[PDB]
Amino acid sequence: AEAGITGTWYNQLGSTFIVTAGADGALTGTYESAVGNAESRYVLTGRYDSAPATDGSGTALGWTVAWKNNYRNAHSATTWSGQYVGGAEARINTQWLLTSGTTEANAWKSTLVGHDTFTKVK
Amino acid sequence: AEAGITGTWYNQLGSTFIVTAGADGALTGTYESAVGNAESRYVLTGRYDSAPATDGSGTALGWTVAWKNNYRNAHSATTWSGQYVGGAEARINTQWLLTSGTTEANAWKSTLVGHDTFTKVK
Amino acid sequence: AEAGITGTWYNQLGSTFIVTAGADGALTGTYESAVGNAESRYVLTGRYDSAPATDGSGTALGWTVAWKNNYRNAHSATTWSGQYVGGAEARINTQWLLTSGTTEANAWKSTLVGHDTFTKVK
Amino acid sequence: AEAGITGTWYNQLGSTFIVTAGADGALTGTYESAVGNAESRYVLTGRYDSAPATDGSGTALGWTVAWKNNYRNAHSATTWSGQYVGGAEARINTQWLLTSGTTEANAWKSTLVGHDTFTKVK
Ligand SMILES: O=C(O)CCCC[C@@H]1SC[C@@H]2NC(=O)N[C@@H]21
Ligand SMILES: O=C(O)CCCC[C@@H]1SC[C@@H]2NC(=O)N[C@@H]21
Ligand SMILES: O=C(O)CCCC[C@@H]1SC[C@@H]2NC(=O)N[C@@H]21
Ligand SMILES: O=C(O)CCCC[C@@H]1SC[C@@H]2NC(=O)N[C@@H]21
Numbered sequence: 161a162e163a164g165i166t167g168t169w170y171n172q173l174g175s176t177f178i179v180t181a182g183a184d185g186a187l188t189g190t191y192e193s194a195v196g197n198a199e200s201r202y203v204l205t206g207r208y209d210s211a212p213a214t215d216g217s218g219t220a221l222g223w224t225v226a227w228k229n230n231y232r233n234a235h236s237a238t239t240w241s242g243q244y245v246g247g248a249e250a251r252i253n254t255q256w257l258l259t260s261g262t263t264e265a266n267a268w269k270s271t272l273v274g275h276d277t278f279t280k281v282k
Numbered sequence: 283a284e285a286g287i288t289g290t291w292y293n294q295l296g297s298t299f300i301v302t303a304g305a306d307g308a309l310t311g312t313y314e315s316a317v318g319n320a321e322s323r324y325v326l327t328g329r330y331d332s333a334p335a336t337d338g339s340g341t342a343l344g345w346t347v348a349w350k351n352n353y354r355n356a357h358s359a360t361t362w363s364g365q366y367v368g369g370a371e372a373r374i375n376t377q378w379l380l381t382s383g384t385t386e387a388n389a390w391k392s393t394l395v396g397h398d399t400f401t402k403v404k
Numbered sequence: 405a406e407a408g409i410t411g412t413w414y415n416q417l418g419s420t421f422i423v424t425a426g427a428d429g430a431l432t433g434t435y436e437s438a439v440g441n442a443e444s445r446y447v448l449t450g451r452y453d454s455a456p457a458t459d460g461s462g463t464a465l466g467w468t469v470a471w472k473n474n475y476r477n478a479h480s481a482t483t484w485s486g487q488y489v490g491g492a493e494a495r496i497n498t499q500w501l502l503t504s505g506t507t508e509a510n511a512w513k514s515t516l517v518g519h520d521t522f523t524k525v526k
Numbered sequence: 527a528e529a530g531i532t533g534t535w536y537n538q539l540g541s542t543f544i545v546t547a548g549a550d551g552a553l554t555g556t557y558e559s560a561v562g563n564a565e566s567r568y569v570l571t572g573r574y575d576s577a578p579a580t581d582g583s584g585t586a587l588g589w590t591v592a593w594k595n596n597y598r599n600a601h602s603a604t605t606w607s608g609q610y611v612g613g614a615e616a617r618i619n620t621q622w623l624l625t626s627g628t629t630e631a632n633a634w635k636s637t638l639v640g641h642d643t644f645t646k647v648k
Contacts, residue, residue, distance in 0.1 A: 173512060185348045186327065195512055205308065205327040207348035209357050209383060217383040218392075222346035222361035226307045226329035235331050239344035239361030241379030243392060255393055255639060257363030257377050257517065261331060261339040268417060268439055270340075270365060271377055273395075273501065273517035273621060275641045295634060317634055377517060379639065390539060390561055395499060395623065395639035397519045429592045430571065449552065449571040451592035453601050453627060461627040462636075466605035468588035470551045470573035479575050483588035483605030485623030487636060499623050499637055501607030505575060505583040514584075514609060515621055517639075 161212045161219040164246040170282030177204065177278060179223070185210045191225045197234040198227055208244070218243030221252070236260040240276065252278040283334045283341040286368040292404030299326065299400060301345070307332045313347045319356040320349055330366070340365030343374070358382040362398065374400040405456045405463040408490040414526030421448065421522060423467070429454045435469045441478040442471055452488070462487030465496070480504040484520065496522040527578045527585040530612040536648030543570065543644060545589070551576045557591045563600040564593055574610070584609030587618070602626040606642065618644040 165181035179189035187206035192198075206223025222241040227234035242254025258272040287303035301311035309328035314320075328345025344363040349356035364376025380394040409425035423433035431450035436442075450467025466485040471478035486498025502516040531547035545555035553572035558564075572589025588607040593600035608620025624638040 185325065185350060195509075203307065203329065205329060206346045206361075207325065207327060207359060209348050209350050209355065209359065211350055211355050212383055213357055215385070217357065217385055218389070220348065220357055220359040220381050220383040222348070222359040222379070222381065224328045224344035224346060224361065224363075226331050226342065226344070228307060228331050228333055233331065233333050235335055235339065235342055237329060237331065237342040237344040237363060239328075239346065239363040239379070241346075241359060241361040241381040241393065243381055243383045243389070245386065253389065255379050255381070255395075255641070257344070257361070257379060258513075259342050259344065259363040259365055259377070261334055261342040261365045263337070263339055264367065265439075267340070267365070267375065268518050269502075269516050271363065271517050272513050273377075273515050273639070274512050275621070317631075377519070380635075387561075390640050391624075391638050393639050394635050395517070395637050396634050397499070429569065429594060447551065447573065449573060450590045450605075451569065451571060451603060453592050453594050453599065453603065455594055455599050456627055457601055459629070461601065461629055462633070464592065464601055464603040464625050464627040466590035466592070466603040466623070466625065468572045468590060468605065468607075470575050470586065470588070472551060472575050472577055477575065477577050479579055479583065479586055481573060481575065481586040481588040481607060483572075483590065483607040483623070485590075485603060485605040485625040485637065487625055487627045487633070489630065497633065499625070499639075501588070501605070501621050501623060503586050503588065503607040503609055503621070505578055505586040505609045507581070507583055508611065511584070511609070511619065515607065517621075 161208060161210055161244070164250060165208060165221070165244050167280060169252060169278035169280060171276040171278045173276065174282070179204070181208055183210065187221060187223050197232060199231040200229055202227060202229050218245045250280060283330060283332055283366070286372060287330060287343070287366050289402060291374060291400035291402060293398040293400045295398065296404070301326070303330055305332065309343060309345050319354060321353040322351055324349060324351050340367045372402060405452060405454055405488070408494060409452060409465070409488050411524060413496060413522035413524060415520040415522045417520065418526070423448070425452055427454065431465060431467050441476060443475040444473055446471060446473050462489045494524060527574060527576055527610070530616060531574060531587070531610050533646060535618060535644035535646060537642040537644045539642065540648070545570070547574055549576065553587060553589050563598060565597040566595055568593060568595050584611045616646060
């Protein structure tokens with residue numbers, strides 16, 4: 161939790177996420193996607209369990225990114241739900257949901273699901 | 283977007299979520315789950331597309347809740363990814379991922395997936 | 405389980421699914437999607453818990469459809485995982501994953517996730 | 527497609543899946559989970575795109591397993607949706623939904639979501 165989450169992480173797609181975990185569960189930072197209709201950095205906000213468990217369990221967290229910045233607007237948002245595992249080789253394992261804004265008719269195909277693993281090394 | 287999202291919403295489980303959408307894509311508020319290991323209100327933070335599309339598409343958004351407050355700590359976090367549809371009958375349709383902090387061994391079963399529909403009326 | 409699953413079901417999109425549940429957990433039938441790149445009927449196969457629980461719980465089941473038939477080939481497959489609830493108003497509540505065949509590069513966006521509710525009445 | 531899918535695959539959890547892909551899109555075989563409330567082999571059935579795309583894309587497929595056999599009954603079912611990539615290092619990348627049969631009240635927590643990568647070598 162806290163101390164260990166803050167920093168720069170990289171996932172297998174080459175995206176970068178920089179976060180600051182605050183004392184009381186908040187997560188703030190920027191995300192730069194290596195793929196998709198995105199350019200540069202986007203703002204992210206989230207929450208994490210600041211009082212994780214005796215035991216060697218992971219810390220649960222989640223964050224969101226709306227794919228709109230000053231360069232592009234993809235009219236979509238991604239939320240990543242996962243857990244942080246610290247240690248020699250700390251990682252954040254997640255599953256994500258990417259929803260695009262659609263018309264009611266195309267709503268059945270509005271969401272992509274995937275998973276990303278983030279490490280401190282890339 | 284913006285104006286229309288702010289307020290109190292209720293989903294089919296009887297949970298309540300109160301949010302304020304800010305001018306530049308931020309979402310802030312509290313969530314009270316009617317089910318699960320939760321008691322009272324939890325803080326939520328998220329993001330939404332403040333510049334949605336000509337067209338009648340939904341606005342994409344997402345938010346997170348870490349299930350830790352002053353009463354309980356479930357060591358879990360939920361992220362909801364969906365879109366807001368305004369109108370006579372405005373709703374927010376979402377899919378969610380609820381991750382619990384586990385030991386590496388039980389990580390395969392760390393995440394629940396579901397969907398919630400929120401309305402302004404309950 | 406068994407007896408009760410067999411028949412024609414309809415979901416909220418207007419798709420039709422006809423299945424036969426066999427004595428030992430098998431599910432067979434055809435699916436006709438009302439949306440997407442599909443035309444006519446596609447073959448489906450799956451499995452269900454033939455020995456469900458004392459109790460009023462649902463029966464777990466799942467099935468798959470590859471979107472290739474004699475009219476079209478969408479190079480995709482959908483799997484529905486859910487449970488059957490019998491009674492006056494029997495329904496099958498599910499969550500589905502629709503994966504399209506992509507090049508390694510676009511694999512992160514290969515899967516859509518959604519949910520469908522099927523009833524015996526449409 | 528076809529020829530290349532048939533065989534024994536192993537995923538990162540140590541589970542084994544043996545399948546036979548039939549000429550016209552069917553998948554049949556057995557699954558042995560290394561984790562969970564399962565013992566020995568379970569029957570699986572599924573479908574795959576027998577006429578995949580010029581191009582180097584993956585073949586879409588999906589299969590289901592109901593966790594009931596002669597030794598145990600977990601009253602649950604898993605469906606895996608993913609794609610097969612052949613080559614020197616062929617793999618099947620998937621995302622899965624595991625639904626347990628619950629009472630209507632606990633249905634919101636009836637489904638786990640995860641991802642598995644299968645290889646021909648373990
Ligand atoms: O195309 C879009 O809608 C905007 C970019 C989405 C990029 C996604 S979010 C999940 C996956 N992980 C990443 O780092 N990037 C892609
Ligand atoms: O049990 C827990 O881990 C904490 C409560 C989780 C409640 C979930 S989040 C999704 C679903 N929608 C709700 O409003 N509540 C449940
Ligand atoms: O476009 C395709 O790839 C083929 C059709 C997919 C239709 C999907 S599967 C889930 C949802 N429920 C339906 O009945 N149809 C759509
Ligand atoms: O506990 C159960 O309900 C039965 C076993 C479920 C095992 C799951 S399915 C997905 C994941 N991949 C595996 O090979 N095993 C676990």
